[PDB]
Write a protein that binds this DNA or RNA. Sequence first.
RNA 1: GGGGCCUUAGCUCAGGGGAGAGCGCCUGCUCGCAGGAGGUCAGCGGUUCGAUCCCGCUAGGCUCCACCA
RNA 2: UGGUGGCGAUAGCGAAGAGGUCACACCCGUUCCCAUACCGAACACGGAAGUUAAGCUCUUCAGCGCCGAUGGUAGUCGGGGGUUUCCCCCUGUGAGAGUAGGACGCCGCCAA
RNA 3: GCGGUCGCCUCCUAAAAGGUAACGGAGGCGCCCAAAGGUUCCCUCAGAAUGGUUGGAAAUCAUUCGCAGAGUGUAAAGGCACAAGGGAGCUUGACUGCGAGACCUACAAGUCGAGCAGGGACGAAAGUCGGGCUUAGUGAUCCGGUGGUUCCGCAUGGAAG
RNA 4: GGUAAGAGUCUUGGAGGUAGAGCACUGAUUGGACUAGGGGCCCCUACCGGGUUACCGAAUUCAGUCAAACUCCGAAUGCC
Lengths: 138, 120, 178, 82, 48, 84
Amino acid sequence: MLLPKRVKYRREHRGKMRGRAKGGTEVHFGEFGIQALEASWITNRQIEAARIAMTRYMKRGGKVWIKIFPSKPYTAKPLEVRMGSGKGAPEGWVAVVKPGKVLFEISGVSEEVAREALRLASHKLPIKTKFVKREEIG
Amino acid sequence: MITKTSKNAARLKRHARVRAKLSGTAERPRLNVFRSNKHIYAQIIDDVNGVTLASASTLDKDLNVESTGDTSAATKVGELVAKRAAEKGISDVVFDRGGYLYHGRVKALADAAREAGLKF
Amino acid sequence: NRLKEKYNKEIAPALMTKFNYDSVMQVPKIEKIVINMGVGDAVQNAKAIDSAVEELTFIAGQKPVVTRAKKSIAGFRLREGMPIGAKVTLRGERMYDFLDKLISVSLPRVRDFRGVSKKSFDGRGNYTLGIKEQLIFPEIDYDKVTKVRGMDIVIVTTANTDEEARELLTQVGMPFQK
Amino acid sequence: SKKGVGSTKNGRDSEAKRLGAKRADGQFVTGGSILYRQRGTKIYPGENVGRGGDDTLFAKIDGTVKFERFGRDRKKVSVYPV
Amino acid sequence: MRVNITLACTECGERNYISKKNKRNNPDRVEFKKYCPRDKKSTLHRET
Amino acid sequence: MRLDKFLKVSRLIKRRTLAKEVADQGRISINGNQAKASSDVKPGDELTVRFGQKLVTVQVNELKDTTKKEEAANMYTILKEEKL
RNA sequence: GGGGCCUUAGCUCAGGGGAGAGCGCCUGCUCGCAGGAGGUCAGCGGUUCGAUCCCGCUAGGCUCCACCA
RNA sequence: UGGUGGCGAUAGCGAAGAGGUCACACCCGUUCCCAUACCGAACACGGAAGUUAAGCUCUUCAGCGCCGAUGGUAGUCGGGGGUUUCCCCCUGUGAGAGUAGGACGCCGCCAA
RNA sequence: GCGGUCGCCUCCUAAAAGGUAACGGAGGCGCCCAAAGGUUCCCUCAGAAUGGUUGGAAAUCAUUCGCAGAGUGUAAAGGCACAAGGGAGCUUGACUGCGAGACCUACAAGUCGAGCAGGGACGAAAGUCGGGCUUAGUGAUCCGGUGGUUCCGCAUGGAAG
RNA sequence: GGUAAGAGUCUUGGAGGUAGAGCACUGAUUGGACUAGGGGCCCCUACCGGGUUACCGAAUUCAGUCAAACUCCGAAUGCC
């Protein structure tokens, strides 16, 4: 459960998700990670589900780096009301994720353990995923 | 311990705040006075060409004072600045007091320039 | 004015024979001594501000002034007005005339002070000593208001290092804790 | 089944004041006319240009408006006679 | 506490100026000398 | 205000129920005439509240509804007291 | 669900400069006294030098509506 | 060398040397013109004993700060197409960041 | 229907001139100041550490690091330490008649303005001053009240008006 | 009636902070050193302190993110 405890504004515009990832494109903390291929809002509930799904299967191993944070709130007008008459109340928090962005980072385990943990994380996410690793040119 | 600024350091800021008020460039030049610890200097500078129209001081081969800028004998070079101004056809100037408070002996130079022909 | 001739006749060659200098003239003079009151009125109740400021006139011959707050602080407000505390900046040859009677009588008169500031330097050459009572100065009379009013002194040395300021204030005559 | 909800509490705004440039670079200008409308000195007055009480930049003489810069992040309006 | 006041000239007598003052800070009658258009000179003006 | 409220805030009767019972039993008179527990009082009246074998007569000065003794003992002024 | 009024001692209620009564508990004093235990002033966060006092929200307790097919 | 101006900290901060007999500066005293919410610290006056230690100029460090390409990429005017909360080509423009590099000052006037 | 709102000012939405809507998202104003106004002359803020006796994390004082992390009456943006930000002296320009030329554009209205004359304030002089760093703090006409008036006033002289 | 101003395009010069980027401000943040301060437990506390914390994190700092009401920057087009 991730959320900011204080915000400058409680109601914000929904924004746009055009283009690739501005940052967080390359894996640089862990050894393996998930690279996003499509853009959608990722709810903190989905982030918690993916984190528990990785952490349970990695009961012995390193820690998980969560590269995304749900800083943008979304508002939800109450049901069965007419359109307009003011913006509704904020309901939850989402993270704006663009294609190419690294979502979660794992180091300190084997190859197949990391692949299966990332598959179990990816089956909870609403986006198409792929497996990436660190490249050492370099 | 204390490394307070020099008297010339705040004098430059005072000169900057004085020169903001008067431009000195309308075909009418300015009379700049620099007071040192030993004697005084005087120059006439006009923007934008920056040429010095007239300049005089106590430190010269002629005009043995020989007070060299302590007493009210600085009025001699104060009127000699107006003499070099009148020999080159200067009509009028403004007074650029610099970072010095106008109570003398820069005021003595200003009064000597006023009595000798500069109508400021 | 005796200490004014005394330091120029004794300490000024002593510093240059202590260790080498690029400049022969570079003796560090003294610059300012400030006295700080900080009464607080215990608390905000003493309305005799004009007598509290004139209490400082016995210590320093120049007229002291009250100081005004720059920011209100929630414990003891003291708003932007109501000036509380006193600061006097005394200069001239009166540094020499003040330090003469200071190192004459003020330091040994205290019942428990035997050494101050073996570590209390600022790192750039500051001496600051705390005075708690008025009985230290002999010119203060014993039939005064008798309440505990403390003095503060700040000694400013022209030399910019601790190793120079400490070696000047050792040989000017003011003792240290050691 | 209709149900009501409210309210907005943010439905007010002031009238927009038409700031910005009123003349252009290289344009002939008459004396006294408004060059640039301001809230504070976003652009400083320069040669033959005064600043009003509402910080309005205006030409003092007839001429040609030139936009310059003080440096590094400061601007100027000047009017030079023809 | 902030009321509309007028300032009449002491010499001419006409009410030439209007201003405002705070009654709590200024209980007394104010005295500002201003230009009188009838007298062609700056005269003392009094609040009426 | 009401009579029982005035007796409560003036601390003559500390409890409003006791003041209500005393005024309902026909013991308190305002300006000579008898009155109930809800007679409205004015600053400048002559109360004639009757205790047990007392004849305390007070004078109304102000009317403030504060339940604190700092702002309560400034409304009634005792004129004379009679035991019997 | 939408407006309006409150959340203050154990209970019931008054109330920008640092907050109180009656009852319930004590304290010595022979129908009344002069004093003490108990207060996140329901909670968060902004304006300044401080908020029970001003505000944007969360839970709670009352009051008025939730009508026309 | 001193005074006085113009060039977007390529003009600056930090370190190390050198200068003073002329000039500039500290420095020394208050009798005068003048003073600080107080004070010759600041602003005034009169003096050339002591000095470059500081102020100031010259000489080297690219550490901090500053300026800054070429190519590439993102974006985009216009045209076109899909799998149309978005994506892909074509003609032309073209960032920001980063890198190569530059930089520890030039151009005027007067006096000595 | 009910709830909410109705005028003015600031930001975003607003798409790199201007302008631009919604019961869109955030806030303020129906003032204040005889000075917080004008001029002249000086100065530079907030925070960290060290040292201090009542000072403890903070009352007051010295030092560095401080291009502004302060302040700018009130509230948002723009701007301001060549200070519009702080401190003193003298004052009332918080002015009379105006005003070339401009900005916004249904009109009504609103805003800036070089410069002339009359009288000043400050400053040696240059010069500045027609209110506050700017942008809100306010409403037509009609009808009455007050002061002035070489204006008219129903045959004339007055008066009512 | 004025008459040839109007418009498009090439060239040139400007104003204005959007797309994009970035932390140089304002927030929100993820990791490591760093640890102001708070948490248990033993000597002790009638009370000062000390040890271990595989314990939280206000400062500060090396990194990594994000922003309509953040901008050290900054287009293409539009505008004059």
